Design a protein around this nucleic acid. Structure first.
Ligand SMILES: [Mg+2]
Ligand SMILES: [Mg+2]
Ligand SMILES: [Mg+2]
Ligand SMILES: [Mg+2]
Ligand SMILES: [Mg+2]
Ligand SMILES: [Mg+2]
Ligand SMILES: [Mg+2]
Ligand SMILES: [Mg+2]
Ligand SMILES: [Mg+2]
Ligand SMILES: [Mg+2]
Ligand SMILES: [Mg+2]
Ligand SMILES: [Mg+2]
Ligand SMILES: [Mg+2]
Ligand SMILES: [Mg+2]
Ligand SMILES: [Mg+2]
Ligand SMILES: [Mg+2]
Ligand SMILES: [Mg+2]
Ligand SMILES: [Mg+2]
Ligand SMILES: [Mg+2]
Ligand SMILES: [Mg+2]
Ligand SMILES: [Mg+2]
Ligand SMILES: [Mg+2]
Ligand SMILES: [Mg+2]
Ligand SMILES: [Mg+2]
Ligand SMILES: [Mg+2]
Ligand SMILES: [Mg+2]
Ligand SMILES: [Mg+2]
Ligand SMILES: [Mg+2]
Ligand SMILES: [Mg+2]
Ligand SMILES: [Mg+2]
Ligand SMILES: [Mg+2]
Ligand SMILES: [Mg+2]
Ligand SMILES: [Mg+2]
Ligand SMILES: [Mg+2]
Ligand SMILES: [Mg+2]
Ligand SMILES: [Mg+2]
Ligand SMILES: [Mg+2]
Ligand SMILES: [Mg+2]
Ligand SMILES: [Mg+2]
Ligand SMILES: [Mg+2]
Ligand SMILES: [Mg+2]
Ligand SMILES: [Mg+2]
Ligand SMILES: [Mg+2]
Ligand SMILES: [Mg+2]
Ligand SMILES: [Mg+2]
Ligand SMILES: [Mg+2]
Ligand SMILES: [Mg+2]
Ligand SMILES: [Mg+2]
Ligand SMILES: [Mg+2]
Ligand SMILES: [Zn+2]
Lengths: 159, 218, 103, 58
RNA sequence: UCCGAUAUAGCGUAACGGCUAUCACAUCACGCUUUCACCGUGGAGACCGGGGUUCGACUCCCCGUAUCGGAGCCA
RNA sequence: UUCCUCGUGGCCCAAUGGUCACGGCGUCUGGCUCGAACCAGAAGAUUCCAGGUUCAAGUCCUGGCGGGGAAGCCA
RNA sequence: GCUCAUGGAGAACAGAAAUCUCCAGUAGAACAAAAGGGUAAAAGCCCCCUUGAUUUUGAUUUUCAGUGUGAAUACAAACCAUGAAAGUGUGGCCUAUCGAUCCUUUAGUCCCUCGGAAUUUGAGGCUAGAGGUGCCAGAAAAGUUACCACAGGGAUAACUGGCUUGUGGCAGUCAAGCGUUCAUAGCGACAUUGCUUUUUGAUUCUUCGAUGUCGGCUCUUCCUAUCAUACCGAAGCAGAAUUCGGUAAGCGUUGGAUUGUUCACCCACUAAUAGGGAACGUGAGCUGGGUUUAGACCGUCGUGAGACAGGUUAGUUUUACCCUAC
RNA sequence: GUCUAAUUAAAACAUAGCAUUGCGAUGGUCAGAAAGUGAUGUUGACGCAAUGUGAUUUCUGCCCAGUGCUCUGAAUGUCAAAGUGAAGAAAUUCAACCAAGCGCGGGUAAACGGCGGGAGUAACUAUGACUCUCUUAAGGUAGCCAAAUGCCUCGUCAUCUAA
RNA sequence: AGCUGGUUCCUGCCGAAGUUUCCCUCAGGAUAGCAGAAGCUCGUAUCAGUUUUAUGAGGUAAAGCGAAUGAUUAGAGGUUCCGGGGUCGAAAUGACCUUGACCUAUUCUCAAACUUUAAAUAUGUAAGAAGUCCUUGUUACUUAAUUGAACGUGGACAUUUGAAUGAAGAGCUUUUAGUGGGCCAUUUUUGGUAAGCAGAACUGGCGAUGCGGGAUGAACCGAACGUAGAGUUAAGGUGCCGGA
RNA sequence: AAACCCAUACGCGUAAUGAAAGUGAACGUAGGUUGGGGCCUCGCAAGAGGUGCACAAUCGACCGAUCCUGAUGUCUUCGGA
RNA sequence: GGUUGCGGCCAUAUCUACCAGAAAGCACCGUUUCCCGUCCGAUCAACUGUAGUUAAGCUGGUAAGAGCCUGACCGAGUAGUGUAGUGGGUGACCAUACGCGAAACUCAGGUGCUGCAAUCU
């Protein structure tokens, strides 16, 4: 017979870790989640209450509700030819802030600082990021760095 | 009643070993893996000759037994019962299956065809890679031409391509000849029953002096 | 299984609306009434020729029945109903389980 | 007479013909599933705020 | 589901609300016969399970289990 | 090959998951009279093999072996 | 509150295992069951108190059509338990353990209706459950047909043919040994490489608006993996006879008893009585003994009608004048 | 003697003989929508009706547990409608009573049909008159057989043939 | 009749499915998907079968077993008040030796249902005006508390407004057809000796598609088609058949 | 049988919701926020501001049903703000 | 800088064996009337801070220590892998092109950092 249950194919995913079994540190419960916060989902196997379905492991969503012990997360799920929005009520042990948003907001305030700094003299900040450009010309010296000539080596067994 | 080896030559399936899900297999027709003066020390037999595979294939346990017997019987009679130490370096752990059909006239009436065709164990095989060592025999340099012939005779018992390589190491060691020699001239080396222990510059010093005192008595 | 004959649980009787002692019994269906509309209809439909006019079930597969408890509040005599999981054996008179005692 | 049981062949082509559009995001999304203890206060707070702005620019 | 019956020593069986209960068989002995069987005398052994009525339950009332017979059967 | 069933003292056969196991025949000892029959008494078991389930496995669950049985049809 | 499996060291009866003490012990144990996850001042073991396995309905996740059921999640408004308290608790540590309409039945509100108007019974309604559909989105359901029928199917069997070649058959490599001695005159184990498609299977591509199935008779051709004949080589070839091998398919390879037989087995002759293919060559070429319609008998099975690669007997073999080939 | 006219002429059917079963006429078997209606019956147990087997000869063994058929009826058995009694304001409900049938108890196989399994044992060996044990309603008797009935099977021996 | 067969003019534009769930459902239907038509609101975006930067998730390949579980070859050194044997022996918590198990450090080989570790490819999110910051207003929620939460007023920051590339117009709705037998190739992979076998995963194709090439061929290579002309080429080729 | 003319009804619709008894749609410029074509004002233009139909999202309000709360009062059990 | 209370990250913090420990603090330690709990004032509870001791716990250090952590042009750009070819090869498989890129091993180094409050020669 076939078998498609809630925790089917979760053997290694809801495994806990190597040398990180037991209880969870208190920072998970002392973290603070407001509505609109972006959170990644990673299920802890030692907290069986408030778990996500295996589909939402490694999924990033937005908080829409906050309760005593849980947090309401919105996720986008591909169902055929479209996306549907999914509302999970997840305990916070299965929840951590995404660092991408923090790294974006640091750049936001840095760009604001640059703009305010360089508006005092009008020097065309050009705040946009840019890709890694091609490398410019340069000169390579042989002072103490004379070229060392190499050659292909023959075939040996090495056993 | 034994199905030929061309039917199980190539690695077509995953490893299927004896376990608590298989639970019913025959025993290997090879049981001995060390022949000759297996109790000899490392200084007695410096030279090592390998019979290595050049093809990705399976080897039958009975083929291994036949090759072992042929090699040992040649090398004993020529050089002596204690002029070599021969080691079979691959072990048959992969179980082969047979779906047994009726060979009688009137069989389609009962056979049910490919329905319920998952087979039953009937043999074992060893899965070998390219560059993988099948046999390894160590001797003195005086007996090279005898073990080379003993392995050249064993080759006929296997399918595929097998090469005979003279190893640059000291016997069954992972060290080259001059390296082992310049480690045995000092006291880094300590013989055991058949293999050897090496001194490390790591660990407690009391133990490394309790052993290997010839290295410190400089 | 074994259930006690008494149980303190919620009563909705418009005077308690709170937890109260309830007497527990086992529910039994009740005798099927003639003059119920279905039986009247079925007897009318079975009158005459044509034979059996409705289906009659045979393909029984479940060995058990769900067990239902009637919970009578001792104060207002409001009785409630609550159903249990499936059980081949069921008991009200409880001789409790004891750990240390020997076989 | 057996037949073919299952395949996902051609399903991505089919989906991407008119497909993988994100649903969409609006301002002021639904408060559905949100805590009623929060909704009940938000009602009164919005009432008071409207009253205050009315009386302010009255 | 309805009616009726039954459950009793190791087996089976009988009984009045004034008995932890008679019986033939099974076994413990004592007896009697040349012996074997046959046979006689004392014993030790049991009221289907749970509640209720009662100066007193095998026995009456209720519930449940198992068995038998006959009747019935709209999820 | 599939399915069903059984495996028990020297032989035949039985068993509530609840004493290192009921009976009968055979054997042995003694008696009666030389032998049978008969009267008394004893001994004899790793419950087919390998695993597990339970406080407890002969029994409860899986595989193998052996004995038996049923099926093996349309062409 | 305590820490388990296990090991080690000790204590009368007491030993391998009774009870007691100590040390080590990251879980090697237990947590109802299947397996996998998870859990150590606990989710385990012992003890205390309890019924939150409660009420009201709503939302969410999984299966998914984003329907239902089932299961689960987090909240809300009550009422409770527990604990010093924080807090936990809406059944089982998590992942399975279950069920529409209609009908019946119970509980609740004691509410609505019985329509000329009332009272009391009865009945029907509202809301929540139970009685079950395991073919588990849920018909009320025994066989046979060899007297058979119809619509269809090459989506699907019984032939050939095709792919494959396990099985069958044939042939190689190697050489432990046999052969008085001697591996290879002749053989050749343990192993291994292949060919063939005259075996049987596997498969189901073609054919079900039909490609006439077994065998034999008759006739032709082809292959060679050569039985004989021609020429040779080798021998454990003195001769004779025999064995192995090569070039060779040019020429030949029989008559009979029994069997429907293919196959087989015997008699005899023979230089020899080799193997095969050609839609398992060949039915508008025959025959029709057998298989395989309908009649009938037996045995076994079946209540029966009837079934049986079980046996027996009886059972219509059509057309060429066309094209091509000859 | 008879039959599948147009694929089966037979061992199939029939037959005489044998046996069983029902019925004494307000009856048995059968017919008919019904009937002051019919066939058997212009009949009467040496008859009619219904079955089976199939001349003669010689025989027709055991089983009534099962399914059937039949026979018995005092019954703490069950058992419909009608009828009876109580309760009720009535619908109605509840009780007792309740024919046949079933069940209870007997018979019947020339009714349907059925009619064992394992061990040991005779001082050459083999076999097993004999014993033990389990078990059935009874355990396949007299006879017969590789038969039109035997898979194994081209069974084994002999005869028939050169085979 | 869920089954066979047939179903009558032209051109133009668009253009499928053989898959999901349910059904006494498996030669059929409903449902969703794929397609068409009608369009509606707008006007370069509330986009993208793509990359980059940042950030997560994973337990396959590989690898490992002198790291846990399990399998596994070989010896070496050790311990028995305590496995089985012999010898000195009365025995001894007594000795000499043999064989087993157990311990220590080593050694050879392995795992779809083992693993410390662990890719490549695929995958989630984000990269700003619905944004950031400052000030102070509402509440019956929350707080020890004008403390917070949410929603706000007012004010400041504009085209380098917050990476690249492209957008062929973006978004939205209604209705309805056919389809629900599939098949092949590369690669991953299951059963099977294997199969032009059976079954899955990703893409691309045939079906529905002609053209040049592969002599010949549904799928391979190349390339996709209005009618014509000229030129250049793909794949494949240049002895003759045959252009070179 | 055409064409022309016409009354009263009837049908759909203008009110829904509840099994039913039955009750029955404005706090407000017929609400607020966000966006919105078009129009208006200033501006050479760029753009800024005002108004903002339709449509979309969202928070509210009103009617019915359900579950509560249960005033003045009264056939003291009716009524139901 | 040491110590205590409460912690954060959770072995660079653990483990084995030794050594040392001013001051203060923690600790062992002393007693059983009361609250309280045990077979046992051993644990738990209460009282004293008095009679004593750094012996242990605790802190730190030592070890060519085991383990753990970090790094490396160590292995190895290896294995493996995305994409491509009318590439090779009877095949099994293998090379090449444009890309990504390990683990073991080897070597080297390290062996708790830190927050709030209080207290200390
Ligand atoms: Mg993980
Ligand atoms: Mg076939
Ligand atoms: Mg009637
Ligand atoms: Mg299909
Ligand atoms: Mg005796
Ligand atoms: Mg606890
Ligand atoms: Mg659901
Ligand atoms: Mg709660
Ligand atoms: Mg739970
Ligand atoms: Mg139900
Ligand atoms: Mg009802
Ligand atoms: Mg279904
Ligand atoms: Mg029929
Ligand atoms: Mg037929
Ligand atoms: Mg038939
Ligand atoms: Mg076909
Ligand atoms: Mg072959
Ligand atoms: Mg072969
Ligand atoms: Mg075919
Ligand atoms: Mg056909
Ligand atoms: Mg035709
Ligand atoms: Mg023809
Ligand atoms: Mg030849
Ligand atoms: Mg053929
Ligand atoms: Mg012909
Ligand atoms: Mg016939
Ligand atoms: Mg019969
Ligand atoms: Mg047949
Ligand atoms: Mg005829
Ligand atoms: Mg005729
Ligand atoms: Mg006859
Ligand atoms: Mg008459
Ligand atoms: Mg009556
Ligand atoms: Mg009667
Ligand atoms: Mg159905
Ligand atoms: Mg069709
Ligand atoms: Mg996996
Ligand atoms: Mg691997
Ligand atoms: Mg590794
Ligand atoms: Mg390991
Ligand atoms: Mg990413
Ligand atoms: Mg459609
Ligand atoms: Mg459809
Ligand atoms: Mg088609
Ligand atoms: Mg094409
Ligand atoms: Mg290509
Ligand atoms: Mg041209
Ligand atoms: Mg030319
Ligand atoms: Mg609005
Ligand atoms: Zn109450």
């Amino acid at each position: 017979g076939k078998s498609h249950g809630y925790r089917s194919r979760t053997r290694y995913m809801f495994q806990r870790d190597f040398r990180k079994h037991g209880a969870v540190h208190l920072s998970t419960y002392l973290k603070v989640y407001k509505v609109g916060d972006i959170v990644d989902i990673k299920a802890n196997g030692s907290i069986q209450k408030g778990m996500p379905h295996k589909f939402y492991q490694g999924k990033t969503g937005v908080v829409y509700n906050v309760t005593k012990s849980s947090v309401g997360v919105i996720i986008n799920k591909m169902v055929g030819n479209r996306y549907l929005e999914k509302r999970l009520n997840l305990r916070v042990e299965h929840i951590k802030h995404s660092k991408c948003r923090q790294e974006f907001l640091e750049r936001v305030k840095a760009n604001a600082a640059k703009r305010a700094e360089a508006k005092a003299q009008g020097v065309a900040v050009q705040l946009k990021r840019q890709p890694a450009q091609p490398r410019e010309s340069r000169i390579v010296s042989t002072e103490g760095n004379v070229p060392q000539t190499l050659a292909p080596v023959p075939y040996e067994t090495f056993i | 009643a034994r199905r030929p080896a061309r039917c199980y030559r190539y690695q077509k399936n995953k490893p299927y070993p004896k376990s608590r899900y298989n639970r019913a297999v025959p025993d290997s027709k090879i049981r001995i893996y060390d022949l000759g003066k297996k109790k000899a020390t490392v200084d007695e037999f410096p030279l090592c000759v390998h019979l290595v595979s050049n093809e990705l294939e399976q080897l039958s346990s009975e083929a291994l037994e036949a090759a072992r017997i042929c090699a040992n019987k040649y090398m004993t009679t020529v050089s002596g019962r204690d002029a070599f130490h021969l080691r079979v370096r691959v072990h048959p752990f992969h179980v082969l299956r047979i779906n047994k059909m009726l060979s009688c006239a009137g069989a389609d009436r009962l056979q049910q065809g490919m329905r319920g065709a998952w087979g039953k164990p009937h043999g074992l095989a060893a899965r070998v890679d390219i560059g993988q060592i099948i046999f390894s025999v160590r001797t003195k340099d005086s007996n090279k031409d005898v073990v080379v012939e003993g392995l050249r005779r064993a080759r006929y018992k296997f399918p595929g391509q097998q090469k005979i390589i003279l190893s640059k190491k000291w016997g069954f060691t992972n060290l080259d000849r001059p390296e082992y020699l310049k480690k045995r001239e000092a006291g880094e080396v300590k013989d055991d029953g058949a293999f050897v222990k090496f001194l490390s510059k790591k660990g407690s010093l009391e133990n490394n002096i309790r052993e290997f005192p010839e290295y410190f008595a400089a | 299984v074994n259930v006690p004959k008494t149980r303190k649980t919620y009563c909705k009787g418009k005077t308690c609306r709170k937890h109260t002692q309830h007497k527990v019994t086992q529910y039994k269906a009740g005798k099927a009434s003639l003059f119920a509309q279905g039986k009247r209809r079925y007897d009318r439909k079975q009158s005459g020729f044509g034979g059996q006019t409705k289906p009659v079930f045979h393909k029984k597969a479940k060995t058990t029945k769900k067990v239902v408890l009637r919970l009578e509040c001792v104060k207002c005599k409001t009785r409630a109903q609550l159903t249990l999981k499936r059980c081949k054996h069921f008991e009200l008179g409880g001789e409790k389980k004891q750990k240390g005692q020997a076989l | 007479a057996k037949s073919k049981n299952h395949t996902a062949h051609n399903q991505t082509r089919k989906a991407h013909r008119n497909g993988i559009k994100k649903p969409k995001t609006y301002k002021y999304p639904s408060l559905k599933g949100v805590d009623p203890k929060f909704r009940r206060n938000h009602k009164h707070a919005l009432h008071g705020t409207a009253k205050a702005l009315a009386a302010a620019k009255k």
